[PDB]
Amino acid sequence: DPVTNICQAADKQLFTLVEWAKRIPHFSELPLDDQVILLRAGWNELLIASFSHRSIAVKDGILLATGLHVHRNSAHSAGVGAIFDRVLTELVSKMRDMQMDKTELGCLRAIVLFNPDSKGLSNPAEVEALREKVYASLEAYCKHKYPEQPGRFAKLLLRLPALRSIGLKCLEHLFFFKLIGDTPIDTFLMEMLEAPHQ
Amino acid sequence: EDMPVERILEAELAVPNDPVTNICQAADKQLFTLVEWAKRIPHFSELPLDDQVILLRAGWNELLIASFSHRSIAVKDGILLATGLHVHRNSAHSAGVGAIFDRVLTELVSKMRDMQMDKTELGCLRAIVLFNPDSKGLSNPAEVEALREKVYASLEAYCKHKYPEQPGRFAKLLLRLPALRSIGLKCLEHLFFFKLIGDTPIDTFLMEMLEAP
Amino acid sequence: DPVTNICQAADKQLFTLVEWAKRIPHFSELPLDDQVILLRAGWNELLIASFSHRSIAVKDGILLATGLHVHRNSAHSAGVGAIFDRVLTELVSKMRDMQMDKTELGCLRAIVLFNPDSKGLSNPAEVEALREKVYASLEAYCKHKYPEQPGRFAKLLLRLPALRSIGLKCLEHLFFFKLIGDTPIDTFLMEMLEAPHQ
Amino acid sequence: NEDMPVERILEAELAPNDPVTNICQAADKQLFTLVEWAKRIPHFSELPLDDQVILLRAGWNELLIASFSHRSIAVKDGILLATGLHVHRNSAHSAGVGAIFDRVLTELVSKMRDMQMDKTELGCLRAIVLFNPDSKGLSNPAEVEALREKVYASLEAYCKHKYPEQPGRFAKLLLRLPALRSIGLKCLEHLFFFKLIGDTPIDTFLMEMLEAP
Ligand SMILES: CC1=C(CC(=O)O)c2cc(F)ccc2/C1=C\c1ccc(C(C)C)cc1
Ligand SMILES: CC1=C(CC(=O)O)c2cc(F)ccc2/C1=C\c1ccc(C(C)C)cc1
Ligand SMILES: CC1=C(CC(=O)O)c2cc(F)ccc2/C1=C\c1ccc(C(C)C)cc1
Ligand SMILES: CC1=C(CC(=O)O)c2cc(F)ccc2/C1=C\c1ccc(C(C)C)cc1
Ligand SMILES: CC1=C(CC(=O)O)c2cc(F)ccc2/C1=C\c1ccc(C(C)C)cc1
Ligand SMILES: CC1=C(CC(=O)O)c2cc(F)ccc2/C1=C\c1ccc(C(C)C)cc1
């Protein structure tokens, strides 16, 4: 019964996300209504950034949080090979080519979280302010840890546009469901069809 | 006839914890009832099992929308999901699916109520959707198209008998399927089902988490 | 300049559409605002219904109004083969198998036109009324021309759902543009690039 | 900068009747303005012609949005098209593209106004969008990424010099590109450009024919 395992895995993944956001300086100081808005609008891009960076070691595939490998062949077989190739070329391979470390990933995700354009925010300017403090911190990090790379800071920020559009395509083409859910749903339905019935 | 409209009506009437799992359970529970309904449809179980899976994956969205749309005739300005939850227009706009919510009331619930669509007619329309010969991967689309023909053969017969003064009632019923098709597509992209039965469990889980240690 | 010829052809095709709608009984009697709304909401499905029926004679392709033949090999090459095949299997081929005549097409297109679900109608019930008069007329036609096919009438109406979904996928995936505009736009832009510099 | 002179980028920035064909001609002319601008961008013409076409097809949508968004800094509740026509919020709502219109004002025009984005800074951001190394089919994506690197190197130098009191202005400029990317995708599926410059010519053409004999 893989379905039950994946729903439980997601709840752990969701738990980790909120805990991660609480450790971000000043996030909890925002109005609780604003905290929920930011997680509602950002969880999609925050996950894509995570397993993209986690998949630097992988070749032609993405490594999900459950240790599950997914190769681009399994993706094309599921009819979502176009989006899958965008993850590899625009995120995974670019993250690998520049050797984006875990501090730079965390900063980019905090920037994504502090999205002042999110609809319904009670204090967008405070969100914008926390955004500024994050990337001002990221710039300092890049200057001192990579002094020879004067453009690393902008290079990092200029991967957020590719993350924005990829996040939208995943929601539109049901990328998450069709990567793992195509076959288990056939198995899941067959079980119900053979069950006892009156 | 060969597709007894009585057998179609009998099938219609015979049907804190981690929040994502709670949503999976509700979705699993609602899918199973849809399978038990489809197996009470005449001749459906006689199809190849692989084709039964195809027809379900292809129609599960529209079949559920048809269910709670006709179920919401009694309630007003809201939809009654199978879980007993009474979801209203404001509860859906907060979840970001306000546009779809109004289309369900305007194009399905309200039109169902005006013409007083009985549960026998509902069952036929859902059987027609179930027997969709356009579903991709069908081993023999012709026998699916044949079964569909038997359903709307019986439905027309049922309509001309139960409502003789309304000769065009039969066509009127079929002409709600385009709207049901369009609405079905919007529910997937907006995660309509996920959000309605899960918007509050998620907000509840979040609110508790953001205040927890 | 093939691009310019397409815009002329569109003006003609649009003119033909408005005249067609004015010949429909009682259409012009509707409020002019409602006439525009119904043409705003229906032109997409009305065009798809036309060239799908126009393509009955074609094999593995669709015939556009400008006589331009498009084969599926060119559509799949343009990255829209999925939608293209849906036109063929769900519309063109089905029109062929049942030998849908031009009278049945006109009735179906008029039913699509009189769409009571169109947003902003002044009198939705009046449009629904004209809709009832059309398909009641279509039923009589089917009974006389194909009495041995008692379900022909419903069979026709049950292509409208497929036409609805195919109409939505064409707009979101820009099926019209990508069908032909892959090569002309390259030439169109290349012509702009080889213009004088400075 | 030495390799990507920020001065050349600012120079480039400053440098009835048939309704469909009327729109095509207007779109044709507006597209050509974008091409002439792109050719005056240093090193773009040095690229293979096939790559130049790829970058134009890939960025034309966002490049136009960035253009008329900055030009609408002065006006309020509307956008100022290149033709001088003042389109208002409700005029876009009439076309059914009211949600996109508000996003342009809130996420682009308003933000551009608050930070007093000058035309030099705009030109650089558009040059960054132009040099998109993610565009599919490029013969040498590396040189495109190099050209993009030169641009935002110059912009950062320009920003640290022209606004020394705003150390975070450079990142503030780049962090509008995600919104520009998101909004650009929504304009395509809604036919945003077609409608604004064509909404009225169609109603004019429709109204006159529905009244005509
Ligand atoms: C993309 C994705 C990741 C990757 C990550 O976040 O590292 C993950 C990790 C988890 F632990 C659980 C689920 C997921 C997941 C998608 C998903 C897929 C199907 C479902 C339902 C429909 C069962 C729910 C979610
Ligand atoms: C449907 C949905 C909403 C509601 C909305 O966004 O309209 C939401 C809001 C949040 F704040 C967080 C998650 C979600 C969410 C689904 C979800 C998706 C993946 C996961 C795991 C894999 C981390 C867990 C949950
Ligand atoms: C058949 C099917 C599709 C494909 C489609 O209809 O286009 C889909 C797309 C989605 F995004 C989510 C679910 C589904 C789905 C069935 C399903 C139903 C219950 C569940 C729960 C029990 C975990 C999981 C999956
Ligand atoms: C599908 C289609 C037909 C077929 C028909 O309607 O029978 C047609 C006939 C005409 F005369 C003109 C255009 C079209 C057309 C699509 C189209 C394609 C590109 C464009 C712009 C982007 C230039 C605009 C429209
Ligand atoms: C964008 C657009 C609208 C407005 C909308 O749909 O929001 C509209 C409303 C109408 F009544 C008629 C045409 C159109 C139209 C474009 C169009 C232009 C040429 C053609 C030819 C090829 C038949 C077909 C369609
Ligand atoms: C490059 C390009 C794309 C591809 C994309 O951006 O994804 C597109 C998509 C559309 F839907 C419409 C137009 C276009 C387009 C250019 C174009 C520009 C002027 C014209 C008029 C003058 C006939 C016709 C076409």
Author numbering:
A (entry chain A), C (entry chain D): 263 to 460
B (entry chain C): 228 to 242, 261 to 458
D (entry chain B): 227 to 241, 261 to 458
From the publication, what sentences describe this entry?
Retinoid X receptor α (RXRα), a member of the nuclear receptor superfamily and a validated drug target, exists in different oligomeric forms that regulate a broad spectrum of cellular processes under both physiological and pathophysiological conditions. Like other nuclear receptors, RXRα comprises an intrinsically disordered N-terminal A/B domain with poorly defined functions, a central DNA-binding domain (DBD), and a ligand-binding domain (LBD) in which α-helices are arranged around a central hydrophobic ligand-binding pocket (LBP). A unique property of RXRα is an auto-repressive mechanism involving homotetramerization, in which a ‘dimer-of-dimers’ pack in a bottom-to-bottom manner, with H12 from each monomer invading (and invaded by) a neighbouring domain across the tetramer interface. The equilibrium between inactive homotetramers and active homodimers is tightly regulated by ligand binding.
